[PDB]
């Protein structure tokens, strides 16, 4: 139910198509421990909020988008609403993730 983004073009189509729904983006890597830690939680949120769009960007596979989005630590979560980045943080922080969704869902 999380949409896996595999190019820049795909990233941009997903943002447009969200309308004015919150978009939560997990910039992740399969090898990275905090990424493994939070992934079940992130999927479960996807189920909990049907009004919110959940995307995942594999930084190893999607290096261009990682660069464009100024990622340096994983996981990084970015939050978009009307194409605008309304929030961002890094770390497997469940409180912050849910705090930010609460703020803009």
From Swiss-Prot:
Gene Ontology cellular-component terms for this entry are: axon; cytoplasm; cytosol; dendrite; extracellular region; neuronal cell body; nucleus
N6-succinyllysine modification, residue list: 8, 94
**GO biological process annotation, one example:** response to activity
Keywords, A to Z, come to:
Acetylation, Activator, Cytoplasm, Disulfide bond, Electron transport, Nucleus, Redox-active center, S-nitrosylation, Secreted, Transcription, Transcription regulation, Transport
Instruction: Tell me which residues this entry annotates as catalytic.
Output: 32 (nucleophile), 35 (nucleophile)
S-S bridge residues: 32-35
Q: Where in the cell is it found?
A: Nucleus; Cytoplasm; Secreted
- Fill in the PTM field for this protein: In the fully reduced protein, both Cys-69 and Cys-73 are nitrosylated in response to nitric oxide (NO). When two disulfide bonds are present in the protein, only Cys-73 is nitrosylated. Cys-73 can serve as donor for nitrosylation of target proteins.
Q: Where is this site: Deprotonates C-terminal active site Cys?
A: 26
GO MF annotation: an example? protein homodimerization activity
Gene3D superfamilies from the xrefs?
Glutaredoxin
State the oligomer form and interacting partners.
Homodimer; disulfide-linked. Interacts with TXNIP through the redox-active site. Interacts with MAP3K5 and CASP3. Interacts with APEX1; the interaction stimulates the FOS/JUN AP-1 DNA-binding activity in a redox-dependent manner.
Family listed: Belongs to the thioredoxin family.
> What's the name of the protein?
Thioredoxin
Q: Which organism is it from?
A: Rattus norvegicus (Rat)
- Gene that this sequence comes from: Txn
């Amino acid at each position: 139910s999380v949409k896996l983004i595999e190019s820049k073009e795909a990233f941009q189509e997903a943002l447009a198509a969200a309308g004015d729904k919150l978009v939560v983006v997990d910039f992740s890597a399969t090898w990275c421990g905090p990424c493994k830690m939070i992934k079940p939680f992130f999927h479960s949120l996807c189920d909990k909020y049907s009004n919110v769009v959940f995307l995942e960007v594999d930084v190893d596979d999607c290096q261009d988008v990682a660069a464009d989005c100024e990622v340096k630590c994983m996981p990084t979560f970015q939050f978009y609403k009307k194409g605008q980045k309304v929030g961002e943080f890094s770390g497997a922080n469940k409180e912050k993730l849910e705090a930010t969704i609460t703020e803009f869902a």
